[PDB]
């Protein structure tokens, strides 16, 4: 009708377009995106996937060091689960054309190269050069576009679920499609299927500063939430320790692949004060090495920190990071010749909508995969290169339990459309523009890196009022991108928040002044609706 599909997939980055490609040879499938269908975090992806590939290494070594970066509370069937499938899985993407950096050179014959980041304990991440994001999602997206049984609908932004028992169909609360503002014509389209799938990212956006693209506004989790689904761990949210300080990287990342190859993390002044802080130094887990920038930044009264790969060759670096090397000579930096201003940013988020070992959600016929989810793999704090992971693993996982199920559906049925609200006003839209930015500031100051009770009774408090704010005033608004992601953002803080406020203690990237200690006995924070 409007629009018909088997499986609708909300999202195409690794985790949808991935999914999406298993699942075509048989299935119908549309893949939304809410911009063009390459900008999402895959894109940006630098550092490499997760994998164990070297005789040397072990899947045992993978979940050890994943357990121990994730601070404790990591969920073991997943993590090894997980750990056991890659390869694989990264092979599968492999056979999809993707290329990674071949070596030339164990002492006898050729191989993949390398490189390792924090908490790594053995070689184990496969990258293309330092921009492995760009050579996945571009080919993923070209063979979704090539193939008959998928249609990818680029600028369609997904407004909400549409839940069986919230439309008076009988039944068992179930999803049964989902209304999708179509950017391109303004109107909210209807999509129905058998299947829906939120691969809509992570919500790092809902902070000041962060690395992501502008995309990552987190609707997939506020979807989610709307219709029923229980969250959790959104207290976890992690602040990549190295993003640029410069005026003119609107938001930029070095990888930490960087420390994985020797860099260094310097003081204003150019020592190096990790030892300070951990034995692991410049390879320690990000939640540490975050917290320990952010101190030294406190102390000081410093801008910022540095990170400096200098002493070593000229050669080596600009063969390992063309990208950015590149990026940052345009901005008058030679990653080759001097220290790089750092500083930490809101990065990804470890938490989102609860999923089991297949991706099912808490509501029949939704599932969710990619950095939306939450499935206990990352505990309290994801280890670099296990997020890319995270993302083929179930997408993998979900076409085989969807393949299962597929036959067995029920017949698609027709539903209401979207209520069209149409009201407009030139200055209230302004103002749409200001909550967004208060939200992400005071979520800087009072759920960033060092928190306290209070600050988060501050969050909350700003957050309801945004909330009683936007029911009053806005309700019946035209929809429009800004105030669609000014919605999930706020829905999502409140989450955040209320996550925060339950953990009594400071655990991974968790941080409060006021339980300074661990909990003998602990776990994941849960919300349900
Ligand atoms: C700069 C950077 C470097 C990183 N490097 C690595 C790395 O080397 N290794 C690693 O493992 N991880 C890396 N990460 C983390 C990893 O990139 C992400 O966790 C992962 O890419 C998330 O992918 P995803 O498929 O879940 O969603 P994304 O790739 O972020 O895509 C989300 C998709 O959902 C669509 N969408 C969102 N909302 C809606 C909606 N409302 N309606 C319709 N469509 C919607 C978006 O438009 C987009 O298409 C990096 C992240 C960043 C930002
Ligand atoms: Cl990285
Ligand atoms: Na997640």
Redesign the pocket.
Known sequence: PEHSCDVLI???????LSLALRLADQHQVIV????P?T????????????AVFDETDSIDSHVEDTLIAGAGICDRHAVEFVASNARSCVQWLIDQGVLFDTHIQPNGEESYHLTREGGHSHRRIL?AADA??REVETTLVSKALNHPNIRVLER???VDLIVSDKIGLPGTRRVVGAW?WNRNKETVETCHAKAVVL????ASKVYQYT???D???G??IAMAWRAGCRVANLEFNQFHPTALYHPQARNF?L?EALRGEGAYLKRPDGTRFMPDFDERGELAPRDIVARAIDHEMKRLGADCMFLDISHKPADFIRQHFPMIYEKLLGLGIDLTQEPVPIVPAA??TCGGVMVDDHGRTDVEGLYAI???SYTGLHGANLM??????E?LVYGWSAAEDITRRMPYAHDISTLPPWDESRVENPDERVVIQHNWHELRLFMWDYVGIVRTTKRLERALRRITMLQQEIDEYYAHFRVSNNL?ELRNLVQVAELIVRCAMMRKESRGLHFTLDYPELLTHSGPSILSP
């Open positions: 909300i999202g195409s980055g690794a985790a949808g939304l995106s809410k911009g269908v900008e999402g975090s895959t894109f940006y992806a630098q550092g490499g996937i997760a990258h492995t994001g369609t932004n997904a999708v691969a809509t990212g992570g690395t992501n693209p995309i990552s506004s609707d997939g990342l990888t990065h990804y990619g950095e939306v670099a290169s296990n997020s890319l992971l993302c669609l």
